[PDB]
Ligand code: HEM
Ligand code: HEM
Ligand SMILES: Cc1ccncc1CCCNCc1ccc2ccc(N)nc2c1
Ligand SMILES: Cc1ccncc1CCCNCc1ccc2ccc(N)nc2c1
């Protein structure tokens with residue numbers, strides 16, 4: 001019931017007690033581990049509010065204070081009457097920061113306390129959401145000196161008045177299925193792109209077209225908006241040694257801004273809460289560029305390098321992979337856009353993990369997601385045992401709005 | 408109950424029913440996943456259902472379930488258990504059991520080969536000298552002048568737990584490690600403790616960087632005895648690089664035969680505490696883990712210097728770059744010397760095909776993603792994108808405590 005994690009490279013053992021606070025279910029059982037699976041009322045509400053308010057008030061050294069008891073009383077009174085309750089600004093900020101802190105799949109959590117929270121609960125329309133999102137993008141981008149931020153739209157009421165950003169990220173490239181059978185652009189984004197077109201987006205049918213925003217306010221029908229091109233910082237990708245690399249025509253955007261997750265705080269649900277940090281290089285160079293179902297550029301790069309691609313054992317894929325990732329890091333650095341390499345990031349996570357065990361009694365972490373998609377065991381996280389469990393406040397997945405939307 | 412797994416690269420969805428036959432626990436609960444944790448005397452009481460479960464599986468597999476032979480065998484085993492408190496497997500049952508322990512090993516990426524396993528029955532062995540002879544024969548058979556053949560040698564099962572057969576080595580062939588007074592380590596740091604034990608037991612150590620350790624063998628619960636594997640039986644491969652001529656001057660080599668000797672084999676409730684087995688290497692085991700783990704030979708820097716990479720900032724990916732070149736060299740050297748080896752691309756590709764075949768023919772394939780995904784270039788191999796279900800089936804290979812921690816010394 002008191003759990004130990006070992007690092008097999010350093011022999012450092014840490015003891016976890018934080019897991020006992022856990023409330024949500026993992027998907028695993030005593031008979032089966034599902035660690036590698038990607039997606040495993042007033043009565044409901046008050047214990048959740050109470051649980052949250054208790055940790056909030058404990059965080060500010062006022063547990064068992066009159067202010068705590070008063071707040072609990074007021075929220076309770078508000079739940080009985082209104083069926084829901086409104087978070088104080090202090091509580092919302094605490095909750096958002098803690099959702100990030102609790103994100104067991106996030107390697108960048110050493111940064112968790114430095115998050116700019118934009119309260120957009122006064123938003124009523126999709127043009128309003130657009131304005132808030134442009135402001136987030138500009139603030140977060142900061143001319144390449146990225147700053148973590150989240151923008152929080154009104155909370156779910158009855159489920160028929162949901163605010164939703166339909167895009168999976170604020171900035172992402174379109175995908176088009178060709179008659180020649182191939183895929184133009186980002187294969188990941190074909191279905192959403194088509195939905196943009198149905199709703200009226202006039203597509204330029206390129207390889208790197210920044211998608212428009214599809215914004216849904218108050219459970220109303222979603223509307224299209226285009227982000228000002230001047231607010232979308234992008235980076236042409238070149239290699240510090242291969243002069244030919246720029247001829248590949250590759251580029252990526254600076255700001256990773258995830259917009260399809262659900263933020264849960266004190267039982268309240270925020271279905272539209274786009275957030276952003278900065279990239280770890282492997283997200284672009286390994287996954288975006290080299291996944292077979294993404295831009296899948298390994299073959300092309302390999303050929304330009306004149307590698308022996310006859311046999312797997314020449315490790316031509318591995319060689320090309322490293323070079324692509326060198327170029328990504330080189331390009332962002334050269335243009336002064338914040339990025340972190342997988343070595344620095346994982347090294348930071350180990351130190352964060354040790355802080356959290358020391359100061360909080362643990363750190364929920366999903367090894368399958370924390371270990372980078374290249375060079376796993378030369379990063380320190382590979383050798384670090386981790387316990388995965390679900391704490392609240394949390395970021396959750398939610399269904400894509402189109403499957404759900406009553407048009 | 409049906410469980411689905413999805414491959415996120417192909418959208419292929421598989422359905423698992425085999426997990427229903429799982430009996431043993433994982434370590435996980437509905438509240439916590441322990442998927443990344445490395446390590447999360449039996450009564451006639453518990454023993455007969457274990458034997459019966461196993462014999463039902465064996466007899467089903469030979470399409471003789473419910474036959475007179477099946478029924479008679481159950482009866483024979485029950486009587487043997489109640490009268491002798493244990494039982495003896497038939498040779499056929501032993502071979503089936505050893506093959507299935509491998510088939511069931513959720514951490515093994517090489518399972519496409521599971522049905523091709525040479526089983527050596529060493530249950531008639533009584534002394535450490537006898538174990539040494541059996542082990543030499545295994546090494547020579549398995550090595551096959553570089554054309555490696557998978558094999559397992561099985562020593563007598565546990566009785567009261569006081570007469571255990573044990574191989575004290577973690578692998579039959581492994582390099583010594585020596586802690587120096589200045590805190591540095593010579594040879595393989597992973598083997599320092601075992602090396603000290605051997606030296607204490609009387610081994611005269613050459614004290615080099617690649618000294619093949621002696622076997623330390625325990626028969627019938629007696630104190631272990633030292634033996635040296637004939638050097639002519641130990642196939643080694645000097646590591647060189649196909650493009651970089653300076654690589655040979657690093658002085659690296661490795662042995663051809665990975666032969667794990669510290670696991671426990673469980674079949675039908677019986678426990679085989681000494682069951683050395685061997686296959687062949689996947690390149691990354693040597694080139695990534697043995698060579699580049701900080702706690703092992705740790706050669707990344709020296710290689711990176713020799714390549715003259717920019718080593719002032721990690722963002723140059725100098726470590727990733729040297730890592731690939733080292734792994735190219737390992738594959739190149741083994742192939743050049745005609746010693747069986749498999750690269751991580753081929754191995755993971757084969758594993759996916761194996762897994763899909765197992766889903767169709769068996770209803771599942773327990774697999775530990777944490778261990779199946781190779782320690783370099785993870786997502787450019789197909790296993791990274793494959794959802795897997797981990798659960799425990801028997802027969803199985805299990806961990807057991809190191810014998811020096813439990814052994815009662817006779818003196
Ligand atoms: C500031 C620099 C940050 C870095 C370097 C970073 C790094 C990462 C990486 C590499 C992943 C894996 C993503 C993938 O493979 O698709 C991830 C996941 C995640 N991050 Fe962070 N992150 C940062 C900031 C943030 C912030 C500000 C938040 C929220 C406020 C956050 C919340 C999450 C969540 C919820 C996941 C899991 C996503 C999922 O399950 O799909 N991250 N992070
Ligand atoms: C024939 C070629 C084989 C290949 C290429 C192969 C590959 C591998 C690899 C790369 C690992 C991970 C090892 C580590 O990281 O420590 C592994 C684990 C394992 N293998 Fe295989 N293997 C082969 C044959 C066998 C055989 C013949 C057996 C048993 C009869 C076996 C049983 C196991 C077991 C039980 C594990 C888990 C070990 C542990 O948990 O420490 N393998 N295999
Ligand atoms: C879960 C799933 C299922 C199907 N397809 C794709 C996915 C991947 C989900 C994408 N998550 C991307 C993400 C989320 C948060 C991030 C935060 C910071 C950062 N640098 N990158 C992030 C990247
Ligand atoms: C259990 C543990 C804990 C910490 N460090 C190390 C370990 C032991 C990991 C050793 N696994 C070795 C192993 C086992 C079976 C194999 C079969 C084939 C093969 N090529 N290699 C294998 C390699």
Ligand SMILES: C[C@H](O)[C@H](O)[C@H]1CNc2nc(N)[nH]c(=O)c2N1
Nearest residue numbers: 036037038368369791792793794
């Ligand atoms: C099947 C497996 O769970 C899936 O491929 C996971 C593996 N680890 C990952 N890790 C990260 N960071 N991101 C991912 O999308 C994935 N995908």
Ligand SMILES: C[C@H](O)[C@H](O)[C@H]1CNc2nc(N)[nH]c(=O)c2N1
Nearest residue numbers: 382383384385443444445777778
């Ligand atoms: C902590 C973590 O479970 C540990 O480092 C594991 C990770 N995956 C592994 N995978 C393999 N094949 N071999 C290993 O030794 C390990 N070590």
Ligand SMILES: OC[C@@H](O)[C@@H](O)[C@H](O)[C@H](O)CO
Nearest residue numbers: 168188189190191192193260
């Ligand atoms: O084309 C639509 C997809 O990009 C979308 O469904 C995402 O994959 C989904 O939101 C998961 O991130």
Ligand SMILES: OC[C@@H](O)[C@@H](O)[C@H](O)[C@H](O)CO
Nearest residue numbers: 577597598599600601602669
């Ligand atoms: O020096 C002894 C080690 O080799 C030994 O303890 C192994 O790590 C152990 O047997 C697990 O393989």
Ligand SMILES: [Zn+2]
Nearest residue numbers: 028033435440
């Ligand atoms: Zn689990």
